[PDB]
C-alpha cells in the first residue's frame with residue numbers, strides 16, 4: 001500500500017503514496033509484467049469531473065469551500081443538461097500542466113509548471129487551426145531560445161466532429177520508397193508522406209523535406225497547409241573536429257512538437273492538442289540518426305572515421321555513435337538553439353523526482369523510457385527504482401486518424 | 408489466452424502461450440508496474456503438488472508422460488514425502504532441473520547456451536572442507552585454461568532450514584574492498600561488508616586494489632569457515648588498450664570467471680541454498696558497470712584525464728567517450744589472452760535468435776527488458792527494440808537474504 005523505491009547508487013530511499021490515487025490500468029498483472037510493451041456517458045462523466053475538480057480546488061487550498069461545491073453543482077447541472085461541460089480557463093491551464101506532470105515517460109518534467117497554454121477552443125476551421133499552429137510554432141521557437149507550449153483545440157463532442165492534427169509532430173521530414181527498393185528521407189513517415197501526396201502535396205522528393213500540415217476541423221476532411229519556411233528553425237550538423245562531417249549533408253529541426261496525442265482533463269477529451277518543448281540530444285543523434293529503421297547512418301560515419309568495421313568487438317558502432325552525438329549537441333549549441341544532453345537531463349529528472357516525492361508523495365515514471373538510449377548506466381536514472389502508474393489528467397495515445405476517418 | 412510481442416525494428420510479431428504455465432507472482436498489479444524494482448521450510452501439504460508439476464514436466468520432456476515409469480516415480484516420491492517429509496531427485500531430474508532454472512532466468516541474456524551446462528552433483532557433501540574441494544574442481548573445470556565452460560555445483564538441499572549449506576561469497580571470485588578512515592575506498596566498494604566479515608573471521612588482508620577474497624563456506628548449518636582458492640586456479644587478465652599505450656599503466660586487471668554463488672535454486676519444490684554457477688563475461692559487465700559505476704571502481708575521470716578530453720562540460724560527452732575506450736580495452740585484453748568473452752552486440756543478437764526459437768518450439772521466453780538491454784549503447788542493440796514479457800517459471804533461481812543476517816552463530 002505504501003511503496004518504497006531505492007536509488008542503488010546513492011542508497012536514497014523514497015516512499016510512494018501517490019500511486020494509491022491511481023485510476024487507469026497498466027497492462028500488467030500479478031502473473032505477467034508488460035513494462036516493455038509500447039502500447040499496453042453522462043453517468044461516466046460526473047465521477048470524472050468530480051475527481052478533477054476536487055484535485056483542482058485542493059491545489060488552490062479551497063477544498064470543500066463554497067466555491068468548490070458551487071462549481072461541482074454547476075458542472076453537474078451542465079452535464080445532466082448538455083451531456084458535457086466546459087472548463088474554466090483556470091481549470092484548463094491546471095489540467096494541461098498536470099497532464100505533463102503525470103506523463104510517466106517524460107524525462108523533462110522538472111519543467112512542468114512552466115507551460116504556456118494557448119486556448120484554441122474558439123477555433124472552427126482548418127485554416128483557423130493553421131493560424132493557431134503557426135503562432136504556437138513562432139512563440140515556442142522564440143529565435144532558438146525555446147519555450148514550452150501547448151495549443152488546445154475544441155474538445156470531442158459526439159466523436160463525429162473531432163479536431164485532429166494528422167501529423168505525428170508539427171515538424172517532421174517526409175519519407176519516400178524508391179524503385180531502388182530503398183527509402184529516401186525518413187522511413188518513419190513513408191505512409192503519412194503518401195497520404196499527403198494522395199491529397200495533392202507536391203513533394204520535393206529530397207532527404208529532408210518538411211511535411212505539410214494535414215489539419216482536420218470539426219470532423220471534416222483534413223486540408224493541407226505549408227508552414228512558413230521562415231517559422232521552421234533547422235540546424236546544419238557539423239562536428240567540432242571532423243571537418244568531413246558537414247559533408248554528410250545532415251540537418252535537423254529545433255522544435256519537437258508532438259501533435260498526435262489526446263489530452264484528457266476531467267473526463268473531457270481534447271483530440272488535437274499539439275505540445276512542444278525542446279530536444280534531448282540523444283533523441284536525434286542516437287534514435288533519429290542511428291536506428292536501423294530511421295536515417296540509419298552508422299555505417300557511413302564509421303567509414304568516414306576509418307574504423308575497423310570487420311568485427312563487432314572493435315566497438316566501431318559505439319565509437320561512431322558517440323561522435324554523431326557530440327556533433328548534434330555541438331551544432332545546436334553553436335547556433336544557439338536550446339538542447340539538453342542526456343547527462344544534464346537525467347540529473348534534472350532525479351532532482352524533480354525528489355521534489356515530487358516530498359511535495360506530492362510520488363512521481364510516476366517509466367524506467368524503460370526514462371533511461372537514455374546510449375550510456376544508460378552512467379546516467380543516474382539507470383540506478384533509480386521507479387514506480388509506473390497512471391494518473392489523470394493525462395496524455396494518451398489514440399489511433400491514427402486515417403484508419404478511422406470516414407471521408 | 409495468447410499474448411503478442413512486436414519488434415519495432417523488424418515488425419516481427421511473436422505469440423506467447425507459455426505465460427499460461429506461470430505460477431509465481433511478479434510484484435506488478437493492474438494499477439502499478441514494478442518492472443524496475445531490483446528485488447520486488449515447506450509443508451508436506453504444499454510439497455507434493457510442487458513435485459508432481461515438476462515430474463510431469465520432466466516426463467513430458469523425455470516423451471514418457473503417463474508412462475508406467477512416470478506413474479511409479481510419482482507414487483515413489485509421494486510415499487517418500489509422506490514418510491520422510493521431503494524427497495531426493497534422481498540425477499537425471501537434477502540435471503534437467505538445473506538446465507531449466509537457467510532456461511527460465513528472465514534477466515539472463517546468455518540463455519542461447521542453456522542446454523550446455525555441466526552439472527556437478529555435490530549432494531554427498533557434508534563439510535566446509537568438502538565444499539572447498541568441490542568449488543576448486545568447479546573453478547578449474549569451468550576455467551579450462553581460458554576456454555570457459557558453463558558449470559553449476561549443487562550442494563545438499565534445505566531440510567528444516569536449520570542445516571543450510573551456504574556460500575557466503577556473492578561470487579566465487581571477487582576482489583576485496585576496504586573502507587579507509589578518510590572515507591575513501593580501496594579495492595571494490597561492492598564487497599566492503601563481506602571483506603569486513605572475512606577479516607573478522609581471521610583473514611589476513613593484503614589490502615591492495617585487486618585482492619581475491621577467500622571463500623567463506625557454511626556446511627550443514629554450522630558456522631562458516633575460510634579457505635583460500637589456490638592462486639594457480641584464479642585466471643586473471645591485465646587490461647590494456649590496442650592503441651592507447653598508457654592504458655596499461657592504469658594498473659587494471661579483472662578475473663576471467665564470473666561465478667554467482669549467492670542464489671537459491673528451486674526444483675520441484677526443493678530448495679538448493681548453495682548452488683554456485685558460472686559461464687563467461689559479456690564485456691560491458693566489467694567495462695561499463697564494474698569499472699565505471701560511481702559506486703564501483705569509478706575510473707571514468709582518470710581515463711578521461713589521460714585522454715585529455717574536454718571535462719569542463721558534460722555536453723562534450725567526455726564520459727561517453729572514455730566509456731567506449733575502456734570497453735574496447737576489456738574486449739581487446741580478454742581476446743589477446745584467449746579468454747572467452749562476448750561483446751554486447753554479438754550477445755544481444757544471439758539472444759534475439761534464442762528468443763525467437765523459444766517462441767516457436769516452447770511457446771514463449773520470459774525476459775526482463777530492464778536487465779536484458781546492455782548498460783551502454785542500448786538502442787543500437789536489437790534487444791532495445793524488442794517487446795518482452797516477464798513472468799516466473801519453475802524450476803528457477805531466486806534471491807535469498809545474505810546469510811550473515813539470518814545465521815544463528817553456534818560459536
Ligand code: HEM
Pocket residue numbers: 100103105106107108109111115148149150275276277278279280283340345369395
Ligand atoms: C522542455 C523540455 C522537454 C524535454 C527535454 C522532454 C523530454 C522527453 C523525452 C526524451 C521523451 C521520450 C520521447 C521519445 O523517446 O520519443 C519524452 C516523452 C514525452 N513527453 Fe516530454 N520533454 C519535454 C517537454 C514536454 C512537454 C512540454 C510535454 C507536454 C506538455 C511533454 C510530454 C511528454 C509525453 C506525454 C511523453 C511520452 C509521449 C510518448 O509516449 O510518445 N514533454 N519527453
Ligand code: HEM
Pocket residue numbers: 505509512514515516517518520524557558559684685686687688689692749754778804
Ligand atoms: C554462458 C555465458 C553467460 C553469459 C554471457 C550470461 C550473461 C548474463 C548477464 C550479462 C547477466 C546480468 C548480470 C548483471 O548485470 O549482473 C546475467 C544474469 C543472470 N544469469 Fe546469465 N550468463 C551466462 C551464463 C549463465 C549461467 C550458466 C547461468 C546459470 C546456470 C546463468 C543464470 C543467470 C541468472 C539466474 C541471472 C540473474 C542474476 C541476478 O538477478 O543477479 N547465466 N547473465
Ligand SMILES: C[C@H](O)[C@H](O)[C@H]1CNc2nc(N)[nH]c(=O)c2N1
Pocket residue numbers: 035036037038368369370415791792793794795
Ligand atoms: C520495445 C521497447 O519498449 C521500445 O523499444 C522502447 C524502449 N524505450 C524507449 N524509450 C524512449 N525514450 N523512446 C522509445 O521510443 C523507446 N522505445
Ligand SMILES: C[C@H](O)[C@H](O)[C@H]1CNc2nc(N)[nH]c(=O)c2N1
Pocket residue numbers: 008382383384385386442443444445777778779
Ligand atoms: C533500478 C534498476 O532496476 C537497477 O539499476 C537495474 C537496472 N538494470 C540492470 N541490468 C543488469 N543487467 N544488471 C543490473 O544490475 C541492473 N540494475
Ligand SMILES: CCONC(=N)NCCC[C@H](N)C(=O)O
Pocket residue numbers: 256257258275276277278279280283284287288
Ligand atoms: C514534444 C515535447 O518535447 N519532447 C521531446 N523532447 N521529444 C518528444 C518526441 C520527439 C522525438 N523523439 C524525436 O526525436 O523527434
Ligand SMILES: CCONC(=N)NCCC[C@H](N)C(=O)O
Pocket residue numbers: 665666667684685686687688689692693696697
Ligand atoms: C555466473 C554466470 O554468468 N553470468 C554472467 N556473465 N555474469 C554474472 C554476474 C557477473 C557480474 N555482473 C560481474 O560483473 O562480476
Ligand SMILES: [Zn+2]
Pocket residue numbers: 028029032033034035435439440441442
Ligand atoms: Zn509490470
